[PDB]
Design a protein around this ligand. Structure first.
Ligand code: HEM
Ligand code: HEM
Lengths: 354, 353
């Protein structure tokens, strides 16, 4: 029962229970003909469906499967696809006749204070989010999906993350030791998810049942953070580190009292925007940082909103300019993708290409 | 019941059951006084014992970074070793330990198909953090590395994974082959004492210890995935799906050497007549600049009581004629001497006194 359904009204991996491991990849389409892209997505639909279920010769041919996931369980594997702005208009030229179908809010995220964006660390035409409760299962799924795109796409970047939840179900803690996700509404609340995440109208029909996905690769200066006092740490966020409770409250789930937390507190500024998003982030570590000599670690920030201009960008502007966490963080990758709606069993992903 | 004992006759993490995740780090000692190193090892012993088992001033930084608070120890083990530079660095013996150097501790010989990065191998101290949860393991490494600031400088930090079968099958590496069939059973004390554990002939601090070989081997996943199934099985000498040697039925059947290729990986290794305890992990590190492909490979880690007799012969054989050379390139190399176990009232490598 470790299988997450692939076909559905929405794509899996958004309101799906947060897995432990993620591989996050972005592709740039190198094919000139649109029919190559339809071929891509057709084989991706077939492969993803095989990978997300338990579906398991000519010795002179390559094996159709790389093989490292053979004895493993699906471990709640989900794969989520999205389109960046470059898929519809690249350098002003709309190369596949899709400019008339561009999502209404799909564009590069605005530059923000404290940005240190690496251009090849964000963007892309296609993004693939592979989530699973086992890293080998997840890398295996991404590896075999990327192999299908050779000749059609060029891999732009590949990110890799983790986020462990509590043994008794406690909110998972990020690399600063604070629980991450209390502020999210319940993914089992259909009304709120339809109000925060899922699109019903106002978009091209392929976005119905879809959403927007924001990606920010945020470096976390662990060495500076670990020298900061516990009180300094609790004051940057506005919650007690151990319990995850707001200031002046008892438990994690008590409501936030804004007049009880600092003005430049992370939670204060975000909740003060009046907007909500669905945060589904993962932590990352990447060895040492050259010239820095410290652990290169941080957060792969991923959130889903039906209107990023109303829900995400106001929060980004607020946090970018005034935020105690900026003292310990620097965003180095940025991207916004449009996720199509779900895939019915007889169709292929994003079948608006026809 | 997810706890691996830290105190013992040997260090944990060598013959201990292979966990899923590893963080592998190497440090260079920047401290000039040997007593700063003794302090470091004491606090490392104290912290490690708290970390590997289950375990107040808001104005001070937290003594624990906290991200593992709600997690199980998940068989966390931490294993320590010393590189050659700890005993003699640039001709200088910096801590009066040259008279205590292990007999077989030295940099590994340069090999054909080597492409070594100097800062991807070597080091004076190595720390191996293994656990069945990556967050648990990184947390253990993070807080151990925090205690070394001002005493050591971190040389490199590697990060790996290796998942075993849902029903206990041998874990498969990123080439899809079962990896570990050839190791003796780590529950055979007689075999482990003959392959891994040191009994005599070494300084007393190595009694119950071993040597640890580290080879960071890049795996050209893109070349391998385009190769025929015949190329893949012929490079190893075992069937990919079953893990069986050629002309044999099951994975654990003995290898028939006259039925696998001469330059086969299993042929060359088995032909040395030597054995080691292989405890490796797979790694992935994003894309490779200039290559544009997945940067992945194997963190080769193995334990031998005599690297000059057991490991170096196998390296020479494989370096020259291994069919795996077509899909792999070693980019990091290191050999560490791991001290023996730690009794409850002592600290790691207490021979420093
Ligand atoms: C390294 C980067 C970040 C870290 C470590 C971090 C951590 C946290 C923590 C500990 C909380 C409080 C617990 C919770 O509500 O889950 C929180 C809340 C929140 N964060 Fe972040 N966060 C980061 C980046 C961001 C970014 C980039 C955004 C938006 C652009 C964002 C939006 C929010 C929101 C909306 C909340 C909930 C506010 C509420 O309670 O109503 N976070 N974050
Ligand atoms: C990317 C690098 C490597 C890969 C993918 C790899 C993989 C494998 C595989 C699939 C086997 C057969 C199953 C088994 O016996 O466990 C094997 C056997 C073995 N390999 Fe490796 N290996 C690599 C590097 C090395 C290195 C660097 C050494 C030694 C310097 C080594 C020594 C051995 C030994 C001793 C055996 C068992 C021989 C026997 O069957 O008696 N391997 N390896």
């Amino acid at each position: 029962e470790q299988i997450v359904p692939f076909y559905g009204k929405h794509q899996a991996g958004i309101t799906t229970a947060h897995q432990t491991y993620v591989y996050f990849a972005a592709l740039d389409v190198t094919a000139k003909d649109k029919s190559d892209i339809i071929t891509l997505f057709r084989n991706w639909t077939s492969l993803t469906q095989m990978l997300t279920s338990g579906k398991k010769r000519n010795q002179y041919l390559p094996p159709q499967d790389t093989g490292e996931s053979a004895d493993l369980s699906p471990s709640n594997l989900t794969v989520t696809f999205g389109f960046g702005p470059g898929f519809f208009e690249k350098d002003g030229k709309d190369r596949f006749g899709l400019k008339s179908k561009k999502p209404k809010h799909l564009a590069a995220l605005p530059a923000m204070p404290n940005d240190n964006l690496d251009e090849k660390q964000g963007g892309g035409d296609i993004c693939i989010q592979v989530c699973a409760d086992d890293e080998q299962v997840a890398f295996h799924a991404l590896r075999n999906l990327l192999n299908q795109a050779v000749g059609t796409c060029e891999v732009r970047f590949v990110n890799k993350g983790f986020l462990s939840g509590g043994k008794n179900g406690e909110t998972p803690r990020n690399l600063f030791g604070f629980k991450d996700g209390t502020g999210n509404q319940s993914t089992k609340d259909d009304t709120l998810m339809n109000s925060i995440v899922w699109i019903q109208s106002g978009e091209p029909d392929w976005m119905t049942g879809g959403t927007y996905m924001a990606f920010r690769k945020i470096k976390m200066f662990l060495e500076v953070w670990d020298r900061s006092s516990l009180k300094d740490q609790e004051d940057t966020f506005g919650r007690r580190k151990s319990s995850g409770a707001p200031f002046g409250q008892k438990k994690e789930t008590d409501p936030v009292k804004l007049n009880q937390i600092p003005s430049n507190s992370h939670v204060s500024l975000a909740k003060s925007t009046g907007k909500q998003i669905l945060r589904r982030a993962f932590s990352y570590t990447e060895g040492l940082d050259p010239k820095t000599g410290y652990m290169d670690a941080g957060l792969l920030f991923i959130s889903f909103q039906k209107n990023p201009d109303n829900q995400f960008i106001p929060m980004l502007k607020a946090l970018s300019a005034k935020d105690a966490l900026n003292e310990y963080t620097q965003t180095i990758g940025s991207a916004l993708y449009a996720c199509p709606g779900g895939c019915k069993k007889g169709e292929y992903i994003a079948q608006r290409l026809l």
